Amino acid sequence: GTHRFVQKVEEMVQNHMTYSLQDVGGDANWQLVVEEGEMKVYRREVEENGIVLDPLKATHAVKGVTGHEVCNYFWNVDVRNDWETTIENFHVVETLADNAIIIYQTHKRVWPASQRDVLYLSVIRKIPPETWIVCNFSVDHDSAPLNNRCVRAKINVAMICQTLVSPPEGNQEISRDNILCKITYVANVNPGGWAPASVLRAVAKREYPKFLKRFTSYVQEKTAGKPILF
Numbered sequence: 213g214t215h216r217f218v219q220k221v222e223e224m225v226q227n228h229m230t231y232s233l234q235d236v237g238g239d240a241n242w243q244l245v246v247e248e249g250e251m252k253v254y255r256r257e258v259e260e261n262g263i264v265l266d267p268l269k270a271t272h273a274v275k276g277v278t279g280h281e282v283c284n285y286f287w288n289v290d291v292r293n294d295w296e297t298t299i300e301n302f303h304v305v306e307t308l309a310d311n312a313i314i315i316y317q318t319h320k321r322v323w324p325a326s327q328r329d330v331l332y333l334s335v336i337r338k339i340p341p342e343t344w345i346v347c348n349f350s351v352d353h354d355s356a357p358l359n360n361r362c363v364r365a366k367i368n369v370a371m372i373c374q375t376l377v378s379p380p381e382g383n384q385e386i387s388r389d390n391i392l393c394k395i396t397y398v399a400n401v402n403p404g405g406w407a408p409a410s411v412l413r414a415v416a417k418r419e420y421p422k423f424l425k426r427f428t429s430y431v432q433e434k435t436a437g438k439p440i441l442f
C-alpha cells in the first residue's frame with residue numbers, strides 16, 4: 213500500500229492477528245452467549261459513561277470454502293446486498309487501492325432509536341494456511357461530515373479466515389470435501405449514543421449470529437461446484 217492509511221491498516225491487521233486470533237473458549241473474561249452448529253458467539257460486557265461497548269468475538273468453521281473466498285465475499289461491495297440485512301444504503305466514498313476503500317453507510321433501525329450511520333475503511337489483506345483478513349474501521353473523511361439525521365457509530369471489525377486442507381490420497385485431486393475455513397469474526401462497536409442496555413445486548417445476540425449463519429451459507433452456495441480459489 214502507497215496510500216495515507218497504510219500505517220493504520222497495518223497496525224489494525226497486526227493487532228487482530230496477535231489479539232483477535234487467541235481462543236476465548238477457555239478465557240474466563242469472555243462469555244459464550246450463542247452456540248449453534250460450529251458457530252460460537254462470545255462477548256465481554258463493557259459499559260463506559262452509560263454506553264454499551266461489549267466487544268463481540270465469534271468463531272465458526274465452514275466446510276467446502278477457502279479463507280480467500282470468504283474474505284472476498286465479505287469485502288466485495290458488489291455482493292453486499294446479496295447477504296446483508298441491516299444496511300439501509302451505502303456507497304464507496306473513496307478508493308484508496310485495489311484492496312482498500314472508504315465506505316459510508318446508513319443502517320436500518322435495528323433497535324428503537326435514531327438510525328446510525330458509519331464511515332469506515334474496508335481493506336482485504338493476505339498474511340503469509342496463509343491468513344486472509346478483512347478489517348473494517350471508522351475513519352473521518354472531508355466528504356462525509358457528521359450530521360443531524362444520524363448518530364455516528366464507531367466500529368472496529370474484522371473477519372479473519374484460515375483454510376485447513378486435507379488432500380486425498382490415491383490419484384484423486386483436491387475437492388471442496390477436503391477443505392474447511394476457520395473463521396474468527398470480531399466486532400467492537402460504539403453505538404454512538406445512549407440506549408437501554410438490555411435492548412442493545414439483545415439486538416447484538418440476535419443480529420450477529422443471524423449474519424454469520426446467512427453469510428457463511430451464502431458463500432457456501434456461491435462457491436459450490438466451482439474451482440477452488442485459495
Ligand SMILES: CCCCCCCCCC(=O)OC[C@H](CO)OC(=O)CCCCCCCCC
Binds near residue numbers: 346348365399403
Ligand atoms: C447500527 C448498528 C451499529 C453499527 C454496527 C455495524 C457492525 C458491522 C460494520 C461492518 O463492518 O459492516 C460491513 C461488513 C462487511 O465488510 O459487514 C459486517 O460486519 C456484518 C455485520 C452485520 C451485523 C451487525 C449487527 C449490528 C447490531 C448492533
